[PDB]
């Protein structure tokens, strides 16, 4: 049987920064949801209009798993309908999800003895996301009456601030490495179906 | 609503340093910066400098580097100015103003002014 | 620095007349220009920004034009409010400059 790749999303090498999350279009399976239910390795798995125990008889046409990596404390910024600085600015789900939000602490490989300074997120911006609109845009956010002219002194700040990530922070600033699938119907043959 | 208060007049000796206070309620303390502005019937008005409570980022005038120093703190919900090296020419009516950039541009909620006399 | 040089300092009209001060900007600010009312005793209120618009509970006569070197703020048909003294800053870069300010009292 020619099972989904599960191994190459979830068990990675390096994942995403959450500002730029990971996109990646999952069909033509026999998708198997239940190694991943009964796993005992995830420290989240709240699937959110699906029961979890009938994920496996009921075909989709598509899934998306959006990889990326945040704080432990910052998961709960994943849910539909809560906000904060991740569900505002860096990824937004929308309240009529059907899906699953799986999670894990990676402290051993996202961690450096002077801190990981590559999973960055996005601090400053505009006005807050709608559903799945990444926004990869490096340039100046001005908060003050002055125009910024592209130089970053003063109420001109960088929008994208690094988690320091220690092997010391906490359980709760230590990184967590979020896995979120979404289904789809599309009116079309239903591919992923297991 | 709306509102920057502030104390009314503060009595000092020349020479040390006072502390002026400016606190905010009706909105978001941290999102908006705080300019301060200092008025005289000699030279009008005068930009101190600004503040950004929720970064810390400081800017000062160049007529007043040194001379005064902002701070400001999340929990506190108050910014705070001290005067450095005070003289005689210093007493002014000082005010604390919002800048409020996302609905309107310029300086728009401004406090009630304390009057510093150094004598 | 920039500095927002008022042609003139004192004006004197009486109550229902037309009445203009100007406000000219030394380099190019743009339209970033903003006006501010003023009487003895009270924080600078503020009237205008962009130049152009009104803050949220002016009335419609304080008209503001102008933009790049020269603004200007117009007030037609003077009344018991418009008596008082005017500034005008830029803010089109650090640090921003007030104007000197001018004054209205009556004919």
């Known amino acids: 049987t020619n099972l989904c790749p599960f191994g190459e999303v979830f068990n990675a090498t390096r994942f995403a920064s959450v500002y730029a999350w990971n996109r990646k279009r999952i069909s033509n399976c026999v998708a198997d949801y239940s190694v991943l239910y009964n796993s005992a390795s995830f420290s989240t798995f709240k699937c959110y209009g699906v029961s979890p125990t009938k994920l496996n008889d009921l075909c989709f046409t598509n899934v998306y798993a959006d990889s990326f990596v945040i704080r432990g404390d910052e998961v709960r910024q994943i849910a539909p309908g809560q906000t904060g600085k991740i569900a505002d600015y860096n990824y937004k789900l929308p309240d009529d999800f059907t899906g699953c939000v799986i999670a894990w602490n990676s402290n051993n490989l996202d961690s450096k003895v002077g801190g990981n300074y590559n999973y960055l997120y996005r601090l400053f911006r505009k006005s807050n996301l709608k559903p799945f609109e990444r926004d990869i845009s490096t340039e100046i956010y001005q908060a003050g009456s002055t125009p910024c002219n592209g130089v970053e002194g003063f109420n001109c700040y960088f929008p994208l601030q690094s988690y320091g990530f220690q092997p010391t922070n906490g359980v709760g600033y230590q990184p967590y490495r979020v896995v979120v699938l979404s289904f789809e119907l599309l009116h079309a043959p239903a591919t992923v179906c297991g | 609503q709306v509102q920057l208060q502030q104390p009314g007049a503060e009595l000092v000796k020349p020479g040390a340093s006072v502390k002026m206070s400016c606190k905010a309620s009706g909105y978001t303390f941290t999102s908006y910066s705080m300019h301060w502005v200092k008025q005289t019937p000699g030279q009008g008005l005068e930009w101190i400098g600004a503040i950004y409570p929720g970064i810390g980022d400081t800017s000062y005038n160049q007529k007043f580097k040194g001379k005064a120093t902002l701070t400001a703190d999340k929990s506190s919900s108050t910014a705070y100015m001290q005067l450095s090296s005070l003289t005689s020419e210093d007493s002014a009516v000082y005010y604390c103003?919002?800048?409020?950039?996302?609905?309107?541009?310029?300086?728009?909620?401004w406090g009630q002014g304390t009057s510093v006399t150094v004598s | 620095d920039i500095v927002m040089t008022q042609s003139q300092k004192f004006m004197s009209t009486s109550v229902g007349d037309r009445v203009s001060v100007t406000c000219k900007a030394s380099?190019?600010?743009?339209?970033?220009v903003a006006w501010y009312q003023q009487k003895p005793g009270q924080p600078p209120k503020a009237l205008i920004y962009?130049?152009?618009y009104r803050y949220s509970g002016v009335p419609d006569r304080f008209t503001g034009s102008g933009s790049g070197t020269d603004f200007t703020l117009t007030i037609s048909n003077v009344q018991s409010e418009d008596l008082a003294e005017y500034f005008c800053?830029?803010?089109?870069?650090?640090?921003?400059?007030f104007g000197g300010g001018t004054k209205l009292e009556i004919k």
């Open positions: 800053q830029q803010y089109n870069s650090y640090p921003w400059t």
């Open positions: 962009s130049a152009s």
């Open positions: 103003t919002r800048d409020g950039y996302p609905d309107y541009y310029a300086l728009d909620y």
């Open positions: 380099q190019n600010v743009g339209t970033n």
